[PDB]
Amino acid sequence: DEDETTALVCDNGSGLVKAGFAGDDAPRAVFPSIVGRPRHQGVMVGMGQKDSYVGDEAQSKRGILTLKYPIEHGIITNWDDMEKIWHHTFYNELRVAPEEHPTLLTEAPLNPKANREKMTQIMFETFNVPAMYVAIQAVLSLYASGRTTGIVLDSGDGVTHNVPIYEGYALPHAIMRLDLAGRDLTDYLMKILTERGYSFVTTAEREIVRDIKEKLCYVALDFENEMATAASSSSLEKSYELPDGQVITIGNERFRCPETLFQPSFIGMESAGIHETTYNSIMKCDIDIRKDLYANNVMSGGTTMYPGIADRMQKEITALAPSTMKIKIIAPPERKYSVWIGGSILASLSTFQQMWITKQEYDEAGPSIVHRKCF
Amino acid sequence: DEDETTALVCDNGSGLVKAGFAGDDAPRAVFPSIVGRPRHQGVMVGMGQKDSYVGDEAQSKRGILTLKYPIEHGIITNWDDMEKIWHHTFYNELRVAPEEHPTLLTEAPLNPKANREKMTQIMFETFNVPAMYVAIQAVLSLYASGRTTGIVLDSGDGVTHNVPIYEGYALPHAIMRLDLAGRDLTDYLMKILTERGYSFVTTAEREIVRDIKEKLCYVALDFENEMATAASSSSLEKSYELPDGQVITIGNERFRCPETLFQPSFIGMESAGIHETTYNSIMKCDIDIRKDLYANNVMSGGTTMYPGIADRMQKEITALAPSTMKIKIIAPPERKYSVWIGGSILASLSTFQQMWITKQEYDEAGPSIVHRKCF
Amino acid sequence: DEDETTALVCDNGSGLVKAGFAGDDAPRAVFPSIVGRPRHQGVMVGMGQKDSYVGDEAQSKRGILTLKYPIEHGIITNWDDMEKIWHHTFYNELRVAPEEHPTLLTEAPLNPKANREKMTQIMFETFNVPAMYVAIQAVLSLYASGRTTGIVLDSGDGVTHNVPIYEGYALPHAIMRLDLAGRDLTDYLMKILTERGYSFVTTAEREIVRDIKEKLCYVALDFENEMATAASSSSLEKSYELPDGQVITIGNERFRCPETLFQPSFIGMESAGIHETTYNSIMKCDIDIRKDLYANNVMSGGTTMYPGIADRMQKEITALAPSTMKIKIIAPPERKYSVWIGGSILASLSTFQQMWITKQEYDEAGPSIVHRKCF
Amino acid sequence: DEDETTALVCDNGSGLVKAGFAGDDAPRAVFPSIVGRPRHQGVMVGMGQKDSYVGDEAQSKRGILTLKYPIEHGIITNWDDMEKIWHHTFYNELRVAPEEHPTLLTEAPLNPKANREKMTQIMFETFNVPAMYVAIQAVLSLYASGRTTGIVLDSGDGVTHNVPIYEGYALPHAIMRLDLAGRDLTDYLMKILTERGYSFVTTAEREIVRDIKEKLCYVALDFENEMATAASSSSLEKSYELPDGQVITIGNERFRCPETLFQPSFIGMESAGIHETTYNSIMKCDIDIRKDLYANNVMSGGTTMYPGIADRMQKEITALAPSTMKIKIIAPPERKYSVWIGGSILASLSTFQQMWITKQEYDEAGPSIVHRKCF
Amino acid sequence: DEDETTALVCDNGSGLVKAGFAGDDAPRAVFPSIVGRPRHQGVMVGMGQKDSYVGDEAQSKRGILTLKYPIEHGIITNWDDMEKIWHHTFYNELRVAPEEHPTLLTEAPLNPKANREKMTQIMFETFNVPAMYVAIQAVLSLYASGRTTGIVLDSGDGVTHNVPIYEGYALPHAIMRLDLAGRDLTDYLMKILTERGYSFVTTAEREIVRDIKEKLCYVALDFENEMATAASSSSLEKSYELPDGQVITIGNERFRCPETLFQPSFIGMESAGIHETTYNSIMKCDIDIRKDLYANNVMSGGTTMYPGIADRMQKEITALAPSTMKIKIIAPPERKYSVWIGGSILASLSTFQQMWITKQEYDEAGPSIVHRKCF
Ligand SMILES: Nc1ncnc2c1ncn2[C@@H]1O[C@H](COP(=O)(O)OP(=O)(O)O)[C@@H](O)[C@H]1O
Numbered sequence A, B, C, D, E: 001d002e003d004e005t006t007a008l009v010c011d012n013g014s015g016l017v018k019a020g021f022a023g024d025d026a027p028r029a030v031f032p033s034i035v036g037r038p039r040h041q042g043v044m045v046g047m048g049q050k051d052s053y054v055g056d057e058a059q060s061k062r063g064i065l066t067l068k069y070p071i072e073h074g075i076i077t078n079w080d081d082m083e084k085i086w087h088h089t090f091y092n093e094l095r096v097a098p099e100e101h102p103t104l105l106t107e108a109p110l111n112p113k114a115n116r117e118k119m120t121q122i123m124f125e126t127f128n129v130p131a132m133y134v135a136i137q138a139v140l141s142l143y144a145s146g147r148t149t150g151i152v153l154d155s156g157d158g159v160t161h162n163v164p165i166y167e168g169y170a171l172p173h174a175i176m177r178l179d180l181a182g183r184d185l186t187d188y189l190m191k192i193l194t195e196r197g198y199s200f201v202t203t204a205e206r207e208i209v210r211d212i213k214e215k216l217c218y219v220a221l222d223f224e225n226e227m228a229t230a231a232s233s234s235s236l237e238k239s240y241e242l243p244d245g246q247v248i249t250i251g252n253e254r255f256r257c258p259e260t261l262f263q264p265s266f267i268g269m270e271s272a273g274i275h276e277t278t279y280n281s282i283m284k285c286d287i288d289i290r291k292d293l294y295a296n297n298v299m300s301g302g303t304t305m306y307p308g309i310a311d312r313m314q315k316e317i318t319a320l321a322p323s324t325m326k327i328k329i330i331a332p333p334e335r336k337y338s339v340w341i342g343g344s345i346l347a348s349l350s351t352f353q354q355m356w357i358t359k360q361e362y363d364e365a366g367p368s369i370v371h372r373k374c375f
């Protein structure tokens, strides 16, 4: 605060920017990292009072907006708009200057080497920031839950990761990366929706595709066995008159799309489901290591909030794995803010001082300060 | 030939099947031991005229194939496909029956005891083969070059070996084995390629990873000293517009991956570089033995064809070793066929008759005929 | 104790540090002389609460440790770590100061002359120790059992020894030394394990190799005769589903490795089995001496705890030896602590005062005090 | 020669077979009576062109050989190999048939009665030899130097002897025999080498032990006085970087092993040094006999070629002996061939005809012909 | 006894100390006059409970002892140890003080004049002894058998003597002395044993040489005639598997060593056999004296207990001697204690009082008391 650093806590992504102060219970400032642009065109006298629709203000009015997606995988299509997105975070909501407090961000595992410097360059060289540290997505969720060892599969929208963690951080061998996250599932629904009679192609309806999914589509216990169950007119058929002006008879469609996550074969790829890669990464490890990896299967993120997600991991895991320990998927009561809570503690402890990167340190070692101190 | 044995010469592996007749200069039949399977899916009217893509026919069209890898380390994932691979060798290209000529194969050092019998079983018990002998990979390369004593480090894709050889064959004491060969380097590139902005994950691009490496990536003389040299924009930066439709700005990446071979630390293991193990195996031997081991350091295989491979062995070897003899890595003009030439002579000499295994000998002593005669 | 000497009893080695107080029945403090180092690498926030893993704390968690072996034969690879190992013995477990009590250690027969002074130097010159004496490994086991004459073959991990003992101590003539102990057997298993299909190469699995051996591998009565017995599917084949997640079908492997102890030919050496050297050392002695050497064949150490060890010495000994006395291998009910019990008595008797080395005696005769008083 | 006898000259032993023609200056054919056997094992295609390595051909390549020692004291471990050793002497090097020339050999003093007949049996009964005579080792060295009276101490490898000689040959009373020769010193070095940190145990390094000794180890003038001199860092400390790849810091070790020859106490025996037995054998003789025994102390053999051997005999002899004559050890310029020169003359003179044993004489008196004519 | 003299009876030598009380049948205390010293060396904790091994205690354990021979001919190598030998006789076994009883010892014929006084000096001047008398070895054996005239050849270990005895004691003229006794035969066996293949050189095997002789080696009736008999494989060849662990094929060796006694020519001397000197001493005497000398040829001592000793004296004596009387060697049933029995009577009779030397008599005439009273 003015006369002292005092850092904030932020978990930026391509879905929700979880920013807030220190010592809170839930994120105060939240909005999707997306900028809207007028598509209606024409002239203006009484406009919507916005030139570049952003966040909640943008997501609210979709009809007139052409949602520009900055962070599309990890690569940013354009950095020019990112500058205004950050100008909206500090000055507007938080109402605090960036030339005052440090900044705690999240690191999308295996992000281009140029981004690490490019991002920090916008803070330190451009808008003089006292300090900043970009922690590694998943690792934070471990301490928040109160664990110190297990296997964390933190996936959101950008990318997918299988990170087995121990008291000592893992190494490039058991960990994996895959480009089959939420955004891939969102753009896939429209594809399979054509066989029934739906076509949410354009932008204003591209978001609706995401909306119908989260609050209805359930995951099947056994796709192959429930496919024939579709004949039974009782458990599936349920007219859901969308409270707006349309009926969406979702029968065999409810568990046809979610299966794609575990069955990319419906897309046209070689990559096996995320439950096959789970075996691949574990089976390689030494014999005297797996026993505790199954004891605590950590599954965090919004991807793990679909009605009926743990039950599926009761047959798939037990199949190709030892049978000595008890199996159960751990999904904390509040798994969504798993990353936000963990970062709050580190930003509160004074011991963290001997880790972060100080302002002057950047200038004293140029842009290479990053890879010069950390890895 | 029909009325007489007359053996062939084959050096099978997981990269190139070097088969041909006797008295030739170069291998006639060559193809990778890999089978492809359709991944595009759908229906067929005018197909690619293949049910199980194999060898050159397979490697040619990667886009539609899901390259099934039979020989993955030494262990074969599946033997059912191996039967067709051998059905393609004799009948198709060579156009000669296996019930006619013997067979000279190579032995992957320290291969499971069951394989020795299992392989021969497919020849003798299944497709009646007059005779066969499976010689030991490296030893053949020694006579081909015209040497009788030295240290041969024959490595390809399957496994790595350090075989010091003398007039009398070595013994389990100085020789070593390691699972850090080409295939480990091929699957590693994609890992470190993510820090820059590349992700050749799926199969159709898994092979491209191998292609870019061999015809560009050079080996550094001093990694630690050339890492800082990266700042110099002249010796590294060279836009290589891949003749297809993409630019691959390889600067510090050219000598970052090759170093992994000698620096597994970048992976996450304990195993030291293959140049450390070289010391380990030699330093144990008697004092009055090393002087000639350095005089002729044999380095064969495709692994020893990277621009700038001998220069590195001029500082590493001389460091922890006596300084009495002259040091120089011997890489014959044609080191790739080092194994093929050596086997050709043995398959030509009539004196070899008192060594190989005859057809009936297998039936007269059951499957144990192998370990019963040889070791 | 503070106002008086009162010595402890220690039997240090490269396997178990048998330390404890006086007047006990079993060793209180026990741990392997090995230090672990993080190999997982990365960063730390909630570490394993250890910088240099040691003893039980180290052996417990192998996955993250790179077991540094200090005492590797007798020669110590590095003395810098040995200082902390001894700092862990007194202060932590025993909770007694070294500037208070003497110290009773064991002497690895035929240890470098420099070590005798180097070791004592760390006690007397560095951490002022009132007194210390380093007794000779085997001799102690003789009195513990309650014997005064026979032939003791005390072997553990460091080195092998054949020490015939009489009321008057032996002399360099019948005694022998050999570098073919446990550590040689431990590192050998991985070698022969490759013919079947196992490769416990790296460190985290190097220890597992030692674990599977001790609690399963039995010793054959007649290797050459039991090799053919392997055909019989009843006495060997027994699926041992390792309680973890893997099956280890040990058939002819159970008695293939143990035979190497008595048959180094499987390695590639000239040294005959330890049962041949037994003849060599005895056959030289006078004619009127052997009769009592066979009457009591002492065999101590963990090496003599494999199911079926005495039976083998019923044919090998009787073969090339007189046939007048009764033959039987003496392995006391508790042969493991044979050295610990013997040293306890000497450390209890007050008559021992006229033997040990006093603190000041070291300073009054410099470092040469050792060879100046004793030999 | 074919149409006539004409004898050769041979001085066979367990170190060098000094064979050659008559009228030469130095031995033409020389090699150690040792046979080598492959220990590397495995298979063969380009072998070392030898089944039973012998002599120079064997000593050259030690690494692959398991040096079989035929003549081990006097007793021959095995006679079957001795047959080939002699087949190598005549036919190969000399290129002359044994059924043509006699044979002059040496007699190891006090050799089993059976050997005299057994050896001759292989020549006369097996490979019809015209004649042969086996003269007594030392006596020959007397005439070669040109002396007719004195005390000869001819020792090599087999056994030690103190033979006082006069115009009339000595008698079993002053002469002595002892089993403390070179071979005992060679196998002793490895014993005392363990206190420093060396262990040349196996065969390939057993010979190296003999090599380091002869060309470095010097003999002390006063061991007890030079033991304290070790403190002086100038006369002893001299880094001898063995031209191969190892440093052997020999300080107090140079004169510690040689002393064992004169001080068997370091081994564990009762036998006094060879300089004590010298007194024992002389002090018994009559009073009017010693005066000339000291005047000419003959010391021949390779044992008397260590830098500083005569000086030691200047204090030890003068101590317990009369002081009337001048004392000086006589070691001819060429003392190594002392036995070869003496035998050459006897094999040249025609007067020798009335001494040797003729072919038919053996058959006319059976195998007992030896003890029937000579003693 | 305390209040009165009462003498003991002792026959000390270098083989057996025959001591005991008066009125007994056999000697109670018996042991060889030899002291042992540790040769094994090293350190001690549980020693053999002896600093100076003596007598039975010493002879029992030879392996660790360096048998010190005090009385070596007659001359004592060292008197310092003799003091303890006598301290062991009275105090330990007999449990009686020397300041209480006289002492009856034996006199080695022709012993140095200084010894007579030196010995008595240790008794009278040092350990106040009431009285003592040193009788002449052989003369005692005469009365024991019950004879009063003949020729006694009493030989043991020290020296040889030919003592013709009559009612009146002999005189220096017919009597003789020779240094060719048992000890000379014991040290000779090892010499001739080398021609066959034995070498019992060191101390621990020096005694074994004496052991094998007494209980096997027989004496030939006619050496020259039995030498050829060796060819006959029936009367000689008899495998005597020494009950310990070795075979000693004694054929012509059984009667080769014993002959040396009568044929010193095999050694290298001029002295004729003890049967030639027998003639020499008798042929000189008057003509009218020999007739009774042959009638009773007394032969006592352990030397006359070899199977077949009298038969030899049936041809040798009758050869060069008158043929009027009957010839027969007299060897009493118990000839070993011939000296002990004779001395017992003299020590029992009260008439002996007027002969022995009283305590005070020594002080009243100084050390010369011996030659002053007796001769
Ligand atoms: N209750 C829910 N059920 C299923 N998906 C949800 C739920 N709430 C949010 N999501 C989804 O989670 C994703 C955002 O998760 P988040 O962890 O913020 O991603 P990122 O950090 O990669 O931007 C969006 O795809 C959103 O639709």
Ligand SMILES: Nc1ncnc2c1ncn2[C@@H]1O[C@H](COP(=O)(O)OP(=O)(O)O)[C@@H](O)[C@H]1O
Pocket: B012, B013, B014, B015, B016, B155, B156, B157, B158, B159, B182, B183, B210, B214, B301, B302, B303, B305, B306
């Ligand atoms: N010119 C080259 N430079 C570098 N690597 C090469 C070259 N040519 C071939 N290779 C590589 O060598 C390997 C095949 O070598 P090979 O000896 O046939 O192996 P294997 O016998 O183990 O199947 C492949 O990894 C291939 O990419």
Ligand SMILES: Nc1ncnc2c1ncn2[C@@H]1O[C@H](COP(=O)(O)OP(=O)(O)O)[C@@H](O)[C@H]1O
Pocket: C012, C013, C014, C015, C016, C155, C156, C157, C158, C159, C182, C183, C210, C214, C301, C302, C303, C305, C306
């Ligand atoms: N029950 C057992 N059976 C076989 N080996 C055993 C047993 N218990 C311990 N060992 C082995 O004994 C060795 C340790 O013995 P120890 O006498 O302490 O050796 P050192 O003193 O040389 O360190 C280790 O190799 C260990 O695996």
Ligand SMILES: Nc1ncnc2c1ncn2[C@@H]1O[C@H](COP(=O)(O)OP(=O)(O)O)[C@@H](O)[C@H]1O
Pocket: D012, D013, D014, D015, D016, D155, D156, D157, D158, D159, D182, D183, D210, D214, D301, D302, D303, D305, D306
């Ligand atoms: N220059 C030398 N100095 C010391 N020892 C030597 C020398 N040359 C040879 N020897 C030794 O002499 C011995 C051979 O001597 P030799 O008289 O031939 O013996 P033998 O006749 O008993 O076989 C070997 O031990 C050898 O190492």
Ligand SMILES: Nc1ncnc2c1ncn2[C@@H]1O[C@H](COP(=O)(O)OP(=O)(O)O)[C@@H](O)[C@H]1O
Pocket: E012, E013, E014, E015, E016, E155, E156, E157, E158, E159, E182, E183, E210, E214, E301, E302, E303, E305, E306
């Ligand atoms: N039964 C026996 N046969 C042959 N020699 C024997 C026998 N018993 C003892 N001796 C020998 O007799 C000698 C001892 O005789 P002894 O009369 O006591 O001698 P001394 O009095 O000279 O000491 C020893 O050499 C011993 O080996």
Ligand SMILES: [Ca+2]
Pocket: A013, A137, A154, A155, A156, A157, A301
């Ligand atoms: Ca996420």
Ligand SMILES: [Ca+2]
Pocket: B013, B137, B154, B155, B156, B157, B301
């Ligand atoms: Ca290869």
Ligand SMILES: [Ca+2]
Pocket: C013, C137, C154, C155, C156, C157, C301
């Ligand atoms: Ca031990």
Ligand SMILES: [Ca+2]
Pocket: D013, D137, D154, D155, D156, D157, D301
């Ligand atoms: Ca010699």
Ligand SMILES: [Ca+2]
Pocket: E013, E137, E154, E155, E156, E157, E301
């Ligand atoms: Ca006697």
